[PDB]
């Protein structure tokens, strides 16, 4: 089988966040920008290593099909939480355990992706379960898969 229309719509939007020029391919330069936007600072060598890991046709760049392949499977029951754990840590700017509407809005922004109040209000509402108005690690994990 395959992902739904909306599912596709979500993978493409996250792909466009790496593809700054919008030409359809992710370069090491475009990946670096994203890393720097996250406070991190990798080297050309490391950047190319990250790309080579998913470059199925080995042309030095990543495309949507290449991007989706790596997405549609953590191919690991172990070490998948080690990524979700870091993802959550990226958003929880104050390691308080709870992700707020402001931390989410703050991060999404640094990634050249300005949201709307209504958009930000829906991403949180949908993930919030305990009704505290914030997304804890628990809620975060389930929202992923």
Ligand X SMILES: CCCCOc1ccc([C@@H](C)NCCCNCCC(c2ccccc2)c2ccccc2)cc1OCCCC
Applying the rule CB under 5 A, the residues between 61 and 120 that interact with Ca ion are 66, 92, 94, 96
Is 121 annotated in a binding site? The answer is no
Q: With 0-12 CB in 10 A as exposed, 13-18 as middle and 19+ as buried, what is 33? A: middle
Q: How far is CA 90 from CA 9, 22, 115, in A?
A: 23, 25, 18
Binding mask 79-108 for ligand X (x = CB under 6 A): ----x---x----------------x----
Q: Are 62 and 25 in contact (CB under 8 A)?
A: yes
Q: With 0-12 CB in 10 A as exposed, 13-18 as middle and 19+ as buried, what is 92? A: buried
Nearer to Ca ion by C-beta: 33 or 80?
33
Is 1 annotated in a binding site? The answer is no
Is 32 a binder of ligand X (CB under 6 A)? Answer: no
Instruction: Give the per-residue SS3 of 84-117.
Output: HHHHHHHHCCCCCCEECHHHHHHHHHHCCCCCCH
Is 63 annotated in a binding site? The answer is no
CB of 124 to Ca ion, least distance (A): 9
Is 132 a binder of ligand X (CB under 6 A)? Answer: no
CB atoms < 10 A from the CB of 26, how many?
A: 25
Is 130 a binder of Ca ion (CB under 5 A)? Answer: yes
Among 37, 46, 50, 137, which residue interacts with ligand X (rule: CB under 6 A)?
A: 50
18 beta partners: none
Nearer to ligand X by C-beta: 50 or 137?
50
Binding region for Ca(2+): 19, 21, 23, 25, 30, 55, 57, 59, 61, 66, 92, 94, 96, 98, 103, 128, 130, 132, 134, 139
């Amino acid at each position: 089988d395959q992902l739904t229309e909306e599912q596709i719509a979500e993978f493409k939007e996250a792909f466009s966040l790496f593809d700054k020029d919008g030409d359809g391919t992710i370069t090491t330069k475009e990946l670096g920008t994203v890393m720097r936007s996250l406070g991190q600072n990798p080297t050309e060598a490391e950047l190319q290593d990250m790309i080579n890991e998913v470059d199925a046709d080995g042309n030095g760049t990543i495309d949507f099909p290449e991007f989706l392949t790596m997405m549609a499977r953590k191919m690991k029951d172990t070490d998948s939480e080690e990524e979700i754990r870091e993802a959550f840590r990226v958003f929880d700017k104050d390691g308080n355990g709870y992700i707020s509407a402001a931390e989410l809005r703050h991060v999404m922004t640094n990634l050249g992706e300005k949201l709307t109040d209504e958009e930000v209000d829906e991403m949180i509402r949908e993930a919030d379960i305990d009704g505290d108005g914030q997304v804890n690690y628990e809620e975060f994990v389930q929202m992923m898969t």
